[PDB]
Design a protein around this ligand. Structure first.
Ligand SMILES: CC[C@H](N)C(=O)N[C@@H]1C(=O)N2[C@@H](CC[C@@H]1CN)CC[C@H]2C(=O)NC(c1ccccc1)c1ccccc1
Ligand SMILES: CC[C@H](N)C(=O)N[C@@H]1C(=O)N2[C@@H](CC[C@@H]1CN)CC[C@H]2C(=O)NC(c1ccccc1)c1ccccc1
Ligand SMILES: [Zn+2]
Ligand SMILES: [Zn+2]
Lengths: 102, 103
């Protein structure tokens, strides 16, 4: 089965704890709901389930959207957001990609 | 902003299949009824009980739910039966196709 890559971070509780001193403009509660926990090295976060890691968050970027764009394969992402959400993010990026540059 | 069924008489699925008795066309009658449609009599004309959107000339491969969302995305029945994402996907898909098919 598609097993949780970090079982010790499966609980939301364990995840927000890592964001104790969060100086970055991306909301820590959003990140943790989206499966992420902080590493303690800048804004580096990682998904507890797929292990996908992300840094250098721009102030406006969305945790669930980023999760779906970079790591669409995540099972935690699938059972939380569903197929249509995931495919939606990718379609949108392709459309944008294609409209800009004509 | 009231958004109530345009033909409240056709709200029950059972009322809608009943209209398909002599259905002789490519597209599945249960799939049509399920999507909110009922037959009018004339040809392969169907209308959604809720939005009043009407459709004819069904190709054999075409999906009731998809066509409903493509043509009449505003329907409340469609929304609460399939959800925002579904509806917005059909549209995004069509925009991407058209866009790509150019160069
Ligand atoms: C919210 C996403 C942001 N807009 C973005 O695009 N970030 C990128 C990113 O996070 N990564 C891509 C490249 C950098 C990008 C920004 N400069 C590759 C994957 C990720 C990244 O840097 N991930 C790692 C990593 C660091 C060094 C070597 C290999 C992988 C990472 C590891 C652990 C925890 C977090 C991130
Ligand atoms: C799954 C639909 C099929 N692939 C399609 O594209 N059908 C179109 C369609 O149903 N309509 C579009 C144009 C014809 C197309 C068929 N060549 C316009 C809207 C719809 C249509 O014919 N709607 C009406 C209608 C309005 C004015 C005059 C004649 C028909 C309609 C009325 C009653 C019952 C069904 C449809
Ligand atoms: Zn993940
Ligand atoms: Zn409708």
């Amino acid at each position: 089965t598609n097993l949780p890559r970090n079982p010790s971070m499966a609980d939301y509780e364990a995840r927000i704890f890592t964001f104790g001193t969060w100086i970055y403009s991306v909301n820590k509660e959003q990140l943790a709901r989206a499966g992420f926990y902080a590493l303690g090295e800048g804004d580096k976060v990682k998904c507890f389930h797929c292990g996908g890691g992300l840094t250098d968050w721009k102030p406006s970027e969305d945790p669930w959207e980023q999760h779906a764009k970079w790591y669409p394969g995540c099972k935690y992402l699938l059972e939380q957001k569903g197929q249509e959400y995931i495919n939606n993010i990718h379609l949108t990026h392709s459309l944008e990609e294609c409209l800009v540059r004509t």
